[PDB]
Design an enzyme around this catalytic site. Structure first.
Site, PDB file in Angstrom:
ATOM      1  N   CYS B 170       0.796  -1.243   0.000  1.00 20.86           N
ATOM      2  CA  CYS B 170       0.000   0.000   0.000  1.00 20.86           C
ATOM      3  C   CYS B 170       0.797   1.244   0.000  1.00 20.86           C
ATOM      4  O   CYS B 170       0.198   2.352  -0.107  1.00 20.86           O
ATOM      5  CB  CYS B 170      -0.886   0.116   1.236  1.00 20.86           C
ATOM      6  SG  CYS B 170      -1.412  -1.445   1.902  1.00 20.86           S
ATOM      7  N   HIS B 311      -3.675   7.566   4.829  1.00 19.71           N
ATOM      8  CA  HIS B 311      -3.709   6.178   4.370  1.00 19.71           C
ATOM      9  C   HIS B 311      -5.045   5.496   4.656  1.00 19.71           C
ATOM     10  O   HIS B 311      -5.521   4.684   3.859  1.00 19.71           O
ATOM     11  CB  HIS B 311      -2.587   5.410   5.094  1.00 19.71           C
ATOM     12  CG  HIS B 311      -2.647   3.918   4.913  1.00 19.71           C
ATOM     13  ND1 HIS B 311      -2.381   3.316   3.734  1.00 19.71           N
ATOM     14  CD2 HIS B 311      -2.955   2.909   5.822  1.00 19.71           C
ATOM     15  CE1 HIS B 311      -2.524   1.993   3.880  1.00 19.71           C
ATOM     16  NE2 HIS B 311      -2.865   1.744   5.170  1.00 19.71           N
ATOM     17  N   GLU B 322      -2.753   4.901  12.446  1.00 19.81           N
ATOM     18  CA  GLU B 322      -2.526   6.184  11.773  1.00 19.81           C
ATOM     19  C   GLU B 322      -3.022   7.375  12.616  1.00 19.81           C
ATOM     20  O   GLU B 322      -2.379   8.419  12.661  1.00 19.81           O
ATOM     21  CB  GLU B 322      -3.125   6.203  10.387  1.00 19.81           C
ATOM     22  CG  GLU B 322      -2.824   7.508   9.661  1.00 19.81           C
ATOM     23  CD  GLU B 322      -3.229   7.466   8.195  1.00 19.81           C
ATOM     24  OE1 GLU B 322      -4.184   6.714   7.914  1.00 19.81           O
ATOM     25  OE2 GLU B 322      -2.581   8.169   7.364  1.00 19.81           O
ATOM     26  N   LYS B 342     -10.099   6.885   0.314  1.00 19.52           N
ATOM     27  CA  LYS B 342     -10.473   5.455   0.219  1.00 19.52           C
ATOM     28  C   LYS B 342     -11.950   5.188   0.556  1.00 19.52           C
ATOM     29  O   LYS B 342     -12.477   4.144   0.201  1.00 19.52           O
ATOM     30  CB  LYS B 342      -9.575   4.579   1.073  1.00 19.52           C
ATOM     31  CG  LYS B 342      -8.113   4.585   0.612  1.00 19.52           C
ATOM     32  CD  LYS B 342      -7.269   3.498   1.308  1.00 19.52           C
ATOM     33  CE  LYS B 342      -5.843   3.387   0.721  1.00 19.52           C
ATOM     34  NZ  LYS B 342      -5.016   4.609   1.047  1.00 19.52           N
ATOM     35  N   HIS B 347      -9.618   0.763  -1.503  1.00 17.72           N
ATOM     36  CA  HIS B 347      -8.188   0.618  -1.380  1.00 17.72           C
ATOM     37  C   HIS B 347      -7.582   0.053  -2.652  1.00 17.72           C
ATOM     38  O   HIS B 347      -7.661  -1.146  -2.899  1.00 17.72           O
ATOM     39  CB  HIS B 347      -7.918  -0.327  -0.208  1.00 17.72           C
ATOM     40  CG  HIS B 347      -6.470  -0.398   0.196  1.00 17.72           C
ATOM     41  ND1 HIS B 347      -5.491   0.251  -0.489  1.00 17.72           N
ATOM     42  CD2 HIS B 347      -5.843  -1.097   1.215  1.00 17.72           C
ATOM     43  CE1 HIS B 347      -4.308   0.004   0.102  1.00 17.72           C
ATOM     44  NE2 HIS B 347      -4.525  -0.807   1.156  1.00 17.72           N
ATOM     45  N   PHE B 407       1.595  -3.413   3.996  1.00 20.73           N
ATOM     46  CA  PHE B 407       1.982  -4.744   4.471  1.00 20.73           C
ATOM     47  C   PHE B 407       3.502  -4.926   4.396  1.00 20.73           C
ATOM     48  O   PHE B 407       4.149  -4.494   3.442  1.00 20.73           O
ATOM     49  CB  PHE B 407       1.229  -5.866   3.681  1.00 20.73           C
ATOM     50  CG  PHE B 407      -0.216  -5.510   3.336  1.00 20.73           C
ATOM     51  CD1 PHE B 407      -1.144  -5.235   4.338  1.00 20.73           C
ATOM     52  CD2 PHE B 407      -0.640  -5.410   1.998  1.00 20.73           C
ATOM     53  CE1 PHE B 407      -2.460  -4.882   4.023  1.00 20.73           C
ATOM     54  CE2 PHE B 407      -1.956  -5.073   1.684  1.00 20.73           C
ATOM     55  CZ  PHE B 407      -2.870  -4.804   2.703  1.00 20.73           C
TER      56      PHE B 407
HETATM   57 NA    NA Z   1      -3.123   8.687   1.142  1.00 23.96          NA
END
Ligand code: NA
Ligand code: NA
Lengths: 421, 421
Positions: B170, B311, B322, B342, B347, B407
Site C-alpha cells: 500500500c 492512508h 494512523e 479510500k 483501497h 503490508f
Molecule cells: Na493517502
C-alpha cells in the site's frame, strides 16, 4: 561519498555460504540437476539450478531453520526463507547488528525478486479450485508478496530505514544494489542490506517459459551441460533458485565502525530498451548504454575494465545481443576477460544480479576470474572478445563490471573496484 | 533542484480522466459496487471499488483500446491496460512526447504494483490444472510480470531512461513518486512517468484477504457505505482497482520547455516498522517517522500542513495506528484537515499512493479538500484531530501530505506545495 561492500551472503545451486560457493565455482562445479517430475514431468525442459537440503549437501545445504524458527517458516514462501539465510550471512560478515534505534533507523533493506512467491500463489490458486477459497490460510497474502523478503529481514534485524523491492526481472537485484548506493549518496540510509531472492519453480512458471521457447531442452541426459552461455549449441536458459545479499555503506562509515571493505562500488547505470516486451534489440543498444553510464560514473575508460560477469543466460538471441553490446563498449582484440557464471548456477532471475555481483567482488578480492562452463564452440559473433573458457583464470585484477538485462527491456550494470585501490 | 508535477492521469472506480474523477469525488460520489459472484460468490466480502466499462459509464468508462490496439491487449493483464490509459493521460497533460533519442534517453518510467498480474497468474495456474501446462500461451510470463506495466508504457512512448517497479504493497506508488523525485535530484533522469496500477480481483486474492479478516463484510446491501475510514463501525478495507500516474520533472526543466507546473513536490520520507508482517504498531511510530522525514525534507513545521490525505483504509487496527501517528506529529486541537478518499474509491493497494497523491495535488490546485464519506461517528481516539466529514471543504490551502502505510511494515509519505507558492 565512496561506497563499499562489507558483507556478502549466498544461497545457491552450488551451496550456501559464499566461501564454499566460491570454492565450488572456481573448482569447476555445477549446480544443474534434473528437476523433479512434479515440476518438469510434462515439459521437455528438465534441468534446473536447484538449492539442495543438508541431507543432499551436508557441508553446504540449505537449512532455513537456522535463521527462522520452524513455526515462523510456515508464514513465508521459499524465496523469503532463502533471503533470510543469505541476509544473516552477509550481516554476520559485515558485523552489522545494531541494537540502538538510532542506527536501526539508518538501516535500509532492499531486496528484489523477479517473480516472488510463485509457488505460494500457485498453491493458493490450487486450493481455491479443490477445497474452496473459504479454506485459505490467514497467512496467504504475506506468504507470497514480493516485499516480504525485505520485510521479514527487516523484522528480524529491526531495520527501520527505507524498505525497497525492485521487481524488474533479470535486472532486479542489480537495481537493488544501485538503489542501495543511491540512498547512501542521498543520505537516506547509512547501511543498506541489498540483494535478491528467487524460488519460482513450479510446473506453471516453467511451463510459461517453455511456452515462450525460452528454456533449454536438449541436455536432459547430461544436466551440467544445459547452461552454455556464448556457445554455438546453447538452446535456452536453465532456471535457477537462490538468494544473495550485500551490505552496502559509505567507506567513511565502514572505517569509523571498524568494518573491513571487501570491494568498492564505483558505478551503476540502468536503462530501458523501449523495444519489445521480452527480447532485447539485436545491437544490444540498451545494454550498451547501461554499461557506458556505469563506466562514466566510475570515471573508468573501457580499456581499464579487467573483468565482465556477463548477463548471458544461454539463449541464442539474448547472448548474441549482449555480444553486440560488449563489442560496442569495449571493441575487439583487447578488452576485458568475459564469463557468465550462469553456466554453473543457471539463471536466478531476480537473484542473478546479487549473486553475480558477489562473484565479481570475489574475483577482485582473490584475483580469480570464473570461467564459462560448457563453452566449447564460441559464437563466431564474439570473435575478438576475450571470452574465458571453462577453467577459471588466476590473474590479479582491479575493476569488474556485472550486467543484468531483463524482460520488459530493463538493463542494469554495476561496476566494482578492488579495495584497497 | 525544485521538483514539480506537470501531468496527472487516473483510471479509477470513479471513472477515467482526472478532471471527471475529481468532479465526481468532490460532488460526493462513490465507486463502490457489488462484485460479481465469479469473484465474491463464496465470500461475505461482497463490495469492491471497480473500474467500469463505457457501456456502464458512457462519459468516464475504461476503454483500453484507445491506448493499445486490440491485438496487443491480449498480451497484457488488466493492471497493465489501466497503467497504459493513465499514463497516456498524464503524458498528454504534461505535453511530454519526446521524438529525439536525447530526450527519450532522459525519461524514466517508474510504476508500482502491490500484487501485479494476479488475475493472469491465477488463470495460468487454472489452465495448468485443467488443460495442462503444455497448453500455456507463449505470452504467459510477460502478461503478468509487475514490471511490464512500466515496460509497456516505456515501449509505447520510447522512454529509454531508468525503469522501476517498486512492489511495496500500500506504500508502493508513494515510493514510486519519491523514487522519481530522487532520480531527478541525482541527475539520472530529466522526466519521470511515475505511478501505480492494480487490478487484483479474483476469488483467491479476495479469499486471501478475507481469510485474514482484513475485508469489510457488513455492508453488502448498501455497498457505498462499506468503506468508512476513521468511523466507529468500520469493519475492514474494500479492495479497489485502478491506476494513477504523474509526470515528474525539475521546475527548471518544466519552465525551459513551457510546461506548466501543477504542484511542487517538496518532501518524501519512507521507513520500515520492523514490527509485524501485516499489522503496524499501535502507536504508529513507523508512519510517524516517515511523516517527519517528509516534513523535514520540505522544511515545513507540522502547523504549516493544511491537508493530509490519510492512508486510512477502514480497518479497526490500521486506522487507529494512523490516528496515533497523526496525533504524534501534529498534536490535537489545531493541525491539518484530514480525510481518506479510500472512503470513495476503496483501497487501490499499489495504486493507492499515486491516486491519493493526485487527489492531494488537485486539493491544492482548486482549494477543495475531499471529505471522508461514511464518517458518521468518528473514533474517540481521533478527538482533537480535524477530521473532515462527508462533505468536501472549500478552503484555499498551500501544503498537503499524503500517506501510504503497507503490508510488511513499509511506510511512505509525500509532501506537496501549491504552485506558485
Ligand atoms: Na493517502
Ligand atoms: Na552478471
Amino acid at each position: 561519498l565512496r561506497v563499499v561492500v562489507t558483507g556478502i551472503g549466498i544461497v545457491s545451486p552450488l551451496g550456501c555460504g559464499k566461501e564454499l560457493v566460491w570454492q565450488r565455482l572456481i573448482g569447476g562445479g555445477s549446480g544443474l540437476r534434473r528437476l523433479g517430475d512434479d515440476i518438469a514431468g510434462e515439459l521437455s525442459a528438465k534441468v534446473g539450478g536447484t538449492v539442495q537440503d543438508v541431507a543432499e549437501d551436508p557441508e553446504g545445504g540449505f537449512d532455513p531453520e537456522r535463521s527462522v524458527p520452524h513455526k515462523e517458516l510456515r508464514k513465508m514462501d521459499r524465496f523469503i526463507q532463502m533471503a533470510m539465510v543469505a541476509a544473516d550471512e552477509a550481516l554476520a560478515e559485515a558485523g552489522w547488528a545494531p541494537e540502538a534505534e538510532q542506527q536501526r533507523e539508518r538501516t535500509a533493506t532492499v531486496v528484489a525478486s523477479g517473480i516472488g512467491g510463485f509457488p505460494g500463489l500457485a498453491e493458493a490458486v490450487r486450493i481455491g479450485e479443490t477445497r474452496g477459497v473459504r479454506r485459505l490460510s490467514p497467512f496467504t497474502i504475506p506468504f507470497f508478496l514480493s516485499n516480504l523478503a525485505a520485510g521479514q529481514i527487516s523484522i528480524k534485524h529491526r531495520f527501520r530505514g527505507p524498505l525497497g523491492c525492485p521487481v524488474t526481472a533479470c535486472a532486479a537485484s542489480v537495481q537493488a544494489i544501485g538503489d542501495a548506493m543511491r540512498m547512501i549518496r542521498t543520505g537516506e540510509a547509512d547501511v543498506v542490506l541489498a540483494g535478491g531472492a528467487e524460488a519460482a519453480f513450479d510446473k506453471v512458471s516453467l511451463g510459461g517459459f517453455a511456452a515462450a521457447r525460452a528454456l533449454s531442452t536438449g541436455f536432459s541426459e547430461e544436466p551440467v551441460r544445459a547452461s552454455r552461455p556464448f556457445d554455438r549449441d546453447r538452446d535456452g536458459f536453465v532456471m535457477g533458485e537462490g538468494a544473495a545479499m550485500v551490505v552496502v555503506e559509505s567507506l567513511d562509515h565502514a572505517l569509523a565502525r571498524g568494518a573491513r571493505p571487501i570491494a568498492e562500488i564505483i558505478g551503476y547505470g540502468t536503462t530501458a530498451d523501449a523495444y519489445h516486451m521480452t527480447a532485447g534489440p539485436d545491437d544490444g543498444s540498451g545494454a550498451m548504454r547501461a554499461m557506458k553510464l556505469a563506466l562514466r560514473m566510475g570515471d573508468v575508460a573501457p580499456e581499464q575494465v579487467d573483468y565482465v560477469n556477463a548477463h548471458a543466460t544461454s539463449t541464442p538471441v539474448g547472448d548474441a545481443g549482449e555480444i553486440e553490446a560488449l563489442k560496442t563498449v569495449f571493441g575487439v582484440g583487447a578488452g576485458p576477460a568475459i564469463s557468465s557464471t550462469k553456466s554453473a548456477t543457471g539463471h536466478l532471475l531476480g537473484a542473478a544480479g546479487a549473486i553475480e555481483a558477489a562473484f565479481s567482488i570475489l574475483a577482485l578480492r582473490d584475483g580469480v576470474l570464473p570461467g564459462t562452463l560448457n563453452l566449447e564452440h564460441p559464437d563466431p559473433a564474439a570473435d575478438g572478445l576475450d571470452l574465458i573458457g571453462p577453467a577459471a583464470r588466476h590473474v590479479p585484477v582491479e575493476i569488474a563490471l556485472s550486467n543484468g538485462f531483463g524482460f520488459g527491456g530493463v538493463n542494469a550494470s554495476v561496476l566494482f573496484r578492488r579495495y584497497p585501490s
